[PDB]
Design a protein around this nucleic acid. Structure first.
Ligand SMILES: [Mg+2]
Ligand SMILES: [Zn+2]
Lengths: 41, 27, 95, 48, 115, 48, 140
RNA sequence: AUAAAUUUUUAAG
RNA sequence: UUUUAAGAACUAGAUACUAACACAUUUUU
């Protein structure tokens, strides 16, 4: 036991399971807002 | 029969200590 | 996991739900107010709900005089007192 | 030669003591990368 | 009573789904289960400066602290949490926020960050 | 990269003295896959 | 919206009215939730033939969790409905208003690899089709 | 002209 | 005085707590 306990808990955003979740949701919303921008043109 | 071939006993050798004559080289 | 999890599991609760029906357990150290007074039930019960208030009256009453110096804190705690003491009044009134 | 036999054995002991719990495929991976080295270097001699 | 325990003795009847229903009713009346609050042991990533006793939480310090699910939800759906930590010298509560869009924390109410 | 590699000479002794200047062993110290290519293959073993 | 009338033959599925529950009055007081007979609604955009599989609520009297049994039974009748179609009349593709019907149809339709399943990329008003008086008369 | 056969699990930290 | 919670029925599906334990990670493209 040496390093940060934060890595071993879920809520912290810095570790790679949650950062990936944010990546995915943001990517989906980028697709949606992109298509909806193209529709209005 | 144990003729002097094999291991002193199979304990730490992890094998089964199963020995068999070699049909290969005889004549 | 802290025993907060372990005391709330189904295997803990179910025996309490049997003890209510089979006897005189069920605490009152668990549940909260209950919010409304007149909705309470037979006297031998509100009797215990009432002490379930007076005890906190004693704890925080002792928690008044303490020098520990937080004046805002003891202000909100002071209001909490008044609230509870009013509740005590209400439980007496129903009795 | 006897020396580098003992070096190999000592290295296996290395893989063993180093990983308390590394799970599994890490261990097999390390042992692969060790053995393949030993054979690939010593190839012919080992038979005897 | 082994730490790793395979079985748990159950009463001889125990309709399990029935206990799920009656226990589901029981879940409302309890004080702890409904607290809306939470308690978690954690660390301070960004260090600190206290705004009361100006005490310094130097880099990363264990704390018994309090997690709360925030009524905000990042973007359309992402969870966002708010943590509180008491100061060692004084009784003071400092809070966090976790920004999923910007990985680092941002904080409020009772502490400032060192640069 | 051969045009560069012809200006790399003394690679072997360097490989052997990597023992001293860094901790982690390099199980293959007797070849550079750059100069010597790749001296073995396995994948057949897999299927077998 | 253009690909619908291309030479492929596709079908349209609306299961929303398979499960209907209306409010009535009990003899003391309540809100009475009752189940009215539903229907399974599929059409191709070309012929305009309305396939309805009328469903009587007596089938629903022995179950709980009726959302699952709903989507699954509707999927079944889509499967058998495909089994009413010879190779020339087999649909090329199938499209469903909801995306909560995708899985059970993927379950039943495995035997028909030539039949693709697709979600609706456009909101479609096949849910209120019971407002057509002839259809609702045949169902009631 | 050979008949040569090792093991095997629980708790605590 | 003030105050509203409690009961019945229905729905689809995964999430919290603990880190004391181990952390050359090496390596084939
Ligand atoms: Mg200990
Ligand atoms: Zn302080």
């Amino acid at each position: 036991g040496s390093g940060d306990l934060n890595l071993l808990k879920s809520w912290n955003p810095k570790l790679m399971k949650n950062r990936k979740k944010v990546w995915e949701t943001e990517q989906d919303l980028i697709t949606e807002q992109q298509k909806l921008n193209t529709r209005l043109k | 029969s144990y003729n002097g071939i094999g291991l002193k006993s199979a304990k730490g050798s992890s094998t089964s200590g199963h020995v068999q004559r070699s049909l290969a080289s005889n004549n | 996991s802290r025993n907060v999890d372990k005391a709330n599991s189904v295997l803990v609760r179910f025996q309490e739900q049997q003890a209510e029906s089979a006897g005189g357990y069920k605490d009152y150290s668990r549940y909260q107010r209950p919010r409304n007074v007149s909705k309470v039930k037979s006297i031998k019960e509100a009797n215990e709900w009432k002490r379930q208030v007076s005890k906190e009256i004693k704890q925080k009453s002792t928690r008044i005089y303490d020098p520990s110096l937080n004046e805002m804190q003891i202000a909100e705690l002071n209001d909490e007192l008044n609230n509870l003491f009013k509740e005590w009044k209400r439980w007496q009134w129903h009795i | 030669s006897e020396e580098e036999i003992k070096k190999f054995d000592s290295r296996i002991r290395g893989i063993l003591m180093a990983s308390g719990s590394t799970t599994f495929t890490k261990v097999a991976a390390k042992w692969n990368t060790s053995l393949i080295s030993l054979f690939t270097y010593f190839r012919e001699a080992i038979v005897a | 009573s082994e730490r790793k325990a395979i079985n748990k003795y159950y009463p001889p009847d125990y309709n399990p789904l029935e206990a799920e229903k009656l226990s589901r009713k029981m879940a409302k009346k309890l004080k702890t289960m409904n607290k809306s609050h939470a308690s978690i042991r954690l660390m301070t990533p960004f260090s600190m400066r206290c705004l009361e006793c100006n005490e310094y939480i130097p880099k990363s310090r264990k704390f018994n602290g309090k997690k709360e699910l925030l009524k905000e939800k990042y973007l359309d759906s992402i969870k966002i949490y708010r943590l509180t930590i008491s100061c060692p010298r004084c009784a003071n509560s400092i809070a966090f926020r976790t920004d999923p869009g910007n990985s680092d924390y941002v904080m409020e109410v009772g502490g400032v960050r060192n640069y | 990269d051969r045009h560069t590699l012809a200006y790399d000479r003394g690679h072997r002794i360097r490989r052997e003295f990597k023992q001293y200047s860094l901790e982690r062993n390099s199980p293959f110290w007797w070849t550079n896959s750059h100069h010597d290519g790749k001296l073995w293959n396995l994948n057949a073993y897999r299927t077998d | 919206y253009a690909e619908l009338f291309n030479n492929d033959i596709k079908l349209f599925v609306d299961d929303t009215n398979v499960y209907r529950v209306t409010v009535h009055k009990t003899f003391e007081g309540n809100v009475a939730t009752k189940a009215i007979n539903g229907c399974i609604f599929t059409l191709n955009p070309k012929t305009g033939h309305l396939f309805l599989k009328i469903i009587h609520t007596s089938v629903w009297a022995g179950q709980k969790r009726l959302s699952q049994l709903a989507k699954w039974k509707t999927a079944e009748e889509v499967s058998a409905l495909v089994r009413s179609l010879p190779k020339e009349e087999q649909p090329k593709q199938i499209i469903v208003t909801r995306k909560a019907m995708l899985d059970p149809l993927e379950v039943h339709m495995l035997d028909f690899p030539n039949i693709a399943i697709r979600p609706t990329e456009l909101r479609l008003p096949f849910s209120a089709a019971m407002s057509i008086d002839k259809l609702s008369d045949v169902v009631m």
